[PDB]
Amino acid sequence: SMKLQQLRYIWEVAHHDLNVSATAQSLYTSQPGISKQIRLLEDELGVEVFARSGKHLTRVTPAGERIIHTAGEILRKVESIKQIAQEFS
């Protein structure tokens, strides 16, 4: 089963121009940590979200553009649950 954390990671990596180092510092976590969770996700899905050239991301794949876009929808809907909660709070 895919996890929300891996969805947040590919969204953030995509919004830091594929710079995994810059993303790690954005999320206050280690850079190897983010790379692990993404490859678990890609192994779990069986598709590459990010094309690589060595230990380095080069571009978002066709499949990844669709998957990341939908991850943003999931992350925004998770946020709306917390806003629904707080309005009734």
Place this chain on the structure above:
Amino acid sequence: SMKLQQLRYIWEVAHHDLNVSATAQSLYTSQPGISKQIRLLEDELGVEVFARSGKHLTRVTPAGERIIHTAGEILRKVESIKQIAQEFS
């Protein structure tokens, strides 16, 4: 942080007419496991998804109707990701 599992649980509990026992057997898990994950979710959200009367769920709350609906959209969108993966495999 909220988890996909807890979103799957409140949705499944809601589609087994609030019967946690039938839901546990559906998901091949324990009934205490589902209850535990639901109360964690509700503590994080600070709202009750299910109105209670003793060790018993009576109805879905105004807020819970919205949260469960949005949890369903999320669970559907998680499925769209794996359908995107399968296509591109």
